[PDB]
Amino acid sequence: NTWRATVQIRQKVPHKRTFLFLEQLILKHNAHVDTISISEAKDGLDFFYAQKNHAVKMIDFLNAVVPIKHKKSEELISQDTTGATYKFSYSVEIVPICKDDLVVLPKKLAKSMGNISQFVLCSKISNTVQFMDPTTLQTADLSPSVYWRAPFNALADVTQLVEFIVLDVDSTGISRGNRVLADITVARTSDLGVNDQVYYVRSHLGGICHAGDSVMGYFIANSNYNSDLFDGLNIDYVPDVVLVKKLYQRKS
Amino acid sequence: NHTAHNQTRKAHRNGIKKPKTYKYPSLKGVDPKFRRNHKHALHGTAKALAAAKK
Amino acid sequence: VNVPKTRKTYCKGKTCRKHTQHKVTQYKAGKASLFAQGKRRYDRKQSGFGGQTKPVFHKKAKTTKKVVLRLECVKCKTRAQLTLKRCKHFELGGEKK
RNA sequence: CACGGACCAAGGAGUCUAACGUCUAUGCGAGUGUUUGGGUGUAAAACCCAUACGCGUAAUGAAAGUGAACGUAGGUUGGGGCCUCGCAAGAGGUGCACAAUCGACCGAUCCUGAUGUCUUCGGAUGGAUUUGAGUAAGAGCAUAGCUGUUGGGACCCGAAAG
RNA sequence: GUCGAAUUUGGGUAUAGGGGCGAAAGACUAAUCGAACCAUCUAGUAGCUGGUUCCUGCCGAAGUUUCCCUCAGGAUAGCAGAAGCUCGUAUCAGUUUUAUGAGGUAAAGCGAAUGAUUAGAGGUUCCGGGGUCGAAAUGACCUUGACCUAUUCUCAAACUUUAAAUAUGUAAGAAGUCCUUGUUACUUAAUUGAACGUGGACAUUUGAAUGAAGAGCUUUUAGUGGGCCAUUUUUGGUAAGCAGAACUGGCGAUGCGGGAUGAACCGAACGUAGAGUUAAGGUGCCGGAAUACACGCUCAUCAGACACCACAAAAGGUGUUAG
RNA sequence: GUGAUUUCUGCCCAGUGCUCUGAAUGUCAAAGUGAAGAAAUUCAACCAAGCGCGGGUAAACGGCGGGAGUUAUGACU
RNA sequence: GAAGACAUUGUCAGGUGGGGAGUUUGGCUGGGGCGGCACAUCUGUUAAACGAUAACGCAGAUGUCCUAAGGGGGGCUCAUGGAGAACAGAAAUCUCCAGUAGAACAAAAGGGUAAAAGCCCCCUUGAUUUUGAUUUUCAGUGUGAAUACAAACCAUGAAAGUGUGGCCUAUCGAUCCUUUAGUCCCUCGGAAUUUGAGGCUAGAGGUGCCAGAAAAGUUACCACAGGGAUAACUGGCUUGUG
């Protein structure tokens, strides 16, 4: 009973990307000073804070860098008999939508945020969650006050990315800050050797993409998606390839 | 929660009897190639004990 | 995943009694036909002191999809299916592996 | 040191009915049930009665439909009782109910496709690790009784609410 | 407190229940207000408390299994009563013996393999698991480190060659054994096998011991589905009148004799009575019964007196006794 | 909404509200129109307000941090 | 005077709408809440030598992956250690001896495997059709998973055989409604034809609270029906010496 107050951090996703971002940022600003100990969990880690006010001061730090939700309870011990003083617990939950997911948004939710299409990627994850349309570049933000009233899931994790090989890049010529809408022509790693089946897709990977270069991407065709929000889409409007990022083997 | 106390004393009030092992056990579950022959084997030997020995 | 569009499977059809060649498509909904028997105590007894009768579904942790591999025989053309698994997308034809 | 009880008389709580399950009694028995109604009466009693209808004598199928004996209504293993034999013990013959098992028949499903045939109908015969709440010298119907179930205020007294 | 004014008051008159009225307290609206009073639908519903009326006879439980938004409750299975039915030595048994099976805990084993633990000192293309970045990839910044690099000794519920006890499966025959040859569409090169039989032989020691207030079978329904205690084997907890299990007995449902007293310990389980002997316990007196016998020990300025049980530790003491 | 007077009332229109003499073809009900069909029907364009994009507003709800770079700083960046 | 085929009014349709009405706001639990899944399952242990056997006991896994990592057949032997070979070394390729598995078998853990169940090649779809019987959890119901056959057609091998999915133990789902595939079968009940609709038989929409409700808060203004108390004794517990 020496702990006397606790912050409980959890993220439900099996590959915790934003949560590993939290542990390196907390070491940088040295926010963990008043810790009694650190105990791991199945889904995250626990912080045991001796005085109440130090536990609250972490949550003011947690609001600035990561989208959270929190609530508190209490427990009863032994009441020094000066008129009086309960043992508290703070349960902080990170938004599970990672930095580089694929997301099918709800229709009513997507209609408000700039009338973006339902089939977008994740962008930046900051304090607020940012979504980017990969085909025609347009950004939209989701705050935790809007997310937690109607929660949903990501459509694919990091472990569904597929190695591709870029054939050539054609720049259409419209951009904000990302050399946007390069009409990339790209083919699979498995089918470049023995086949000619070539995929043809716009992407945000404009300036950082070159010919003879390996990119990772979400592949909607063979892979098995199961979302009800995805099911109420128009299947002949969904792009086949969503180009995500690049490997770029730097040095040996 | 769970305990097995008094559970042996309940079952040994009416005892533990055997399933009493009848003559002519049922051929359901015996091999069907054998059952198809053994249908005809009893048929001839009931005819043969009808006319010959009487 | 992937399945073929063409499939040599069994026929039970008073003439074939053998395996003939069959054709594959997917699962499509055309109008649910409320000559179906449960939609005119709806269009009877909805319209009432009693009001909107039939309940809906909401507890939507539901996930999967009906994935149809049909066997359209090129020889006789009638109707008894084949099965798949708990599966999430289904395209057919391309990406032979 | 949990709750109710100061004392006395009176009142005071598993009832009734509709439909039913097992068991038991009685009538009649491949039938059974007079009483919705009519006839008569000493008059809400008793007595007498036609035509139907109910349940039963036939199942099975989602249905159109078809619809139960190769035979001393079958073979084997036990089976009370009676018959024969023996002074008896026992041996031998017939063996009801009922228990086990292999068959046969009818309906369903899958198969076999005869004489024929408006050339597409018709379904003879033969099958099968299948399936039925069946046939295989009928047993049900009606009234009453205790026990039990369901719907009723339902063993009596009790809310905060609408 | 205020007391010539936003003062005090009579009568008239207006606003009515999800409505009114409020210099705002959720106040007031006929002793009723976080939604008035009256009658009716209403004997509203209740897995929750309380109560439930005559006697005697016989039999006699359960707090456990699976399933339920299920844990104060129900269905189902078990336990129990009743009505009985076909027969009457039936073949069964909370048991032993013989003949064989199975097991891997106690003990043994570590100079017969495995085997932790506590702490960790440096190794920039011997990795890269990851983080943010970046109009790129000769690309930076970071962290657990990729690596134990040449260390030792010690064990274990998730180590083993060998392997008790106690519990446990099966057999000890009439539906069985042998001789002779019938059936078939299966099986074999083959009427050879297989399976089932006809006919013949084998008899009360007919195939170990002991017992059998008959054995076999079916319908139908009540209550119960909050359990606790003890010895022994144990897990969690320093340790609990603590938390959870295992086999058997008991209390609950059960008095009587003994432990002064006591739900669980010891003896023993109940028709009404008489005589007889005993159990556990006791025999100075209360208090029925030997101030019986026999060998010793012990003196306390808080002696000691009978299992469960209501008391105690190490270590000291020329106090005493026997070694 | 604040609560006499005196004296002051800073910065922010991203968020949520509110608002508009603002661009228009993204969304888009019934009726209507067109096409195919033997007909019931099916499909297609068309499409109001509102939503969406754009502008205004804090005596509207409200907010007023961190990292650096030379070490105390109402410093500059 | 003003206004005019617009306004108003009637009917249907879309938007807005806590101002108002109705209702819900899981369970287990060393009090409830938070965390967690002990709620559906699997391996080792707890577990005391059949089986069974509890705890919010312990160390861990599953909501997948695979036309080969399934089926058959043939050839071959692995981790590692030792001795030798231009560059070549702590680790490239080649060679030989020793080599009971110290390797590998998609993954947790425990079993299993040496002319194989490993490794490298060869041909293939039995990962098929009809439905019964059995084992596990168990009421001897369901569901999942599995075992041994029967009737068909096949694959491989010279052959015996083997194969009804992953070497064994886990990897998954009812009624209702939906939709597709076999007879082109049955019916639309006055009689026909064609669309349409309803049926039988086998399967996929799925409830993860997993034998399967459509569901956010607060009450210190609170109400009702009930249930729990209260402290001062573990087994003798408490004292002066890390």
Place this chain on the structure above:
RNA sequence: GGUUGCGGCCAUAUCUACCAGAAAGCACCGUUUCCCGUCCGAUCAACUGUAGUUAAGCUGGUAAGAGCCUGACCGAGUAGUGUAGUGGGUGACCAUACGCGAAACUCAGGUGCUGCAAUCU
């Protein structure tokens, strides 16, 4: 009795070291046209039993060897355990009554047995 073919039980049959094997049989060895398979006629295929061999293989014998397997008034009636008491002890735990009964170790002895067919101084 010695070999060969096919085996059963699967170390008393293995492992390490040396030593012997008349006979017949297995084996090493000879060759590359055909069938076939490789980088390589070494394995595998075919052809010859002709040119040559017991050097190996295999078989047998030995070693105060390692191992394994049977035996023990060996360890030891010890450890452990079923049942019993108003038995002991503050406890830890230990005695006694009726029962069951190990193991490593120590020592002694052992080193394949055998079924069918055939061929051999």
